Amino acid sequence: EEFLTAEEEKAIVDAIRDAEKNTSGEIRVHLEKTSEIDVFDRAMDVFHNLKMDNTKLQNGVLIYVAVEDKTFVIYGDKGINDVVSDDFWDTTRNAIQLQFKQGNFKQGLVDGIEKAGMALAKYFPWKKDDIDELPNTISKG
Ligand SMILES: [Ca+2]
Ligand SMILES: [Ca+2]
Structure with missing residues (x-):
């Protein structure tokens, strides 16, 4: 909860909004204290549990x-x-x-x-009728 100040969190959410004007890709950040031994599997579970698969082009990415x-x-x-x-x-x-x-x-x-x-942006260019498919909120676990 203290990982980031409100001002830092605001800067991150603003960075996501700016990035999503360059691509149709969707970006979220998830923070938690400790991971699992297989960090990839844990990130895949979080991606699923945040329903980040809900993009037309299957182009969501979790940090x-x-x-x-x-x-x-x-x-x-x-x-x-x-x-x-x-x-x-x-x-x-x-x-x-x-x-x-x-x-x-x-x-x-x-x-x-x-x-x-x-x-x-190289593979998924931004389009005029872009939808903000995933929330830009930082997910905390
Ligand atoms: Ca979008
Ligand atoms: Ca978004």
């Missing part, structure tokens, strides 16, 4: 963070995985890690969100 460990997973839906190459999320991960290793938690998420919108 899952385990705050006590400062570890994270970028989990994209099937629409993304069917078209992108193996290095797709590298710039997003690097942008988050660069800031997390310096203790800049808010900035890591903002920078990752911005990078993710630009990466998704």
Whole structure:
């Protein structure tokens, strides 16, 4: 609950809104204290439980963070995985890690969100009648 201040949370939600003007992809952040040994499986469960599969193009992506460990997973839906190459999320991960290793938690998420919108834009361009399919709220567990 104290992971982020209200001002930091506002900056993150504003970064999602800006990223979603560059792509039809949908982005959410989920924060929790501790993860499971298989972090990918935990992020997949959270993605499901947040109903992030409810996008026309199956292009939702969850940035899952385990705050006590400062570890994270970028989990994209099937629409993304069917078209992108193996290095797709590298710039997003690097942008988050660069800031997390310096203790800049808010900035890591903002920078990752911005990078993710630009990466998704390559395969999922924003369209005039875009729908905001998933809430931009930070999910807390
Ligand atoms: Ca949208
Ligand atoms: Ca959204």
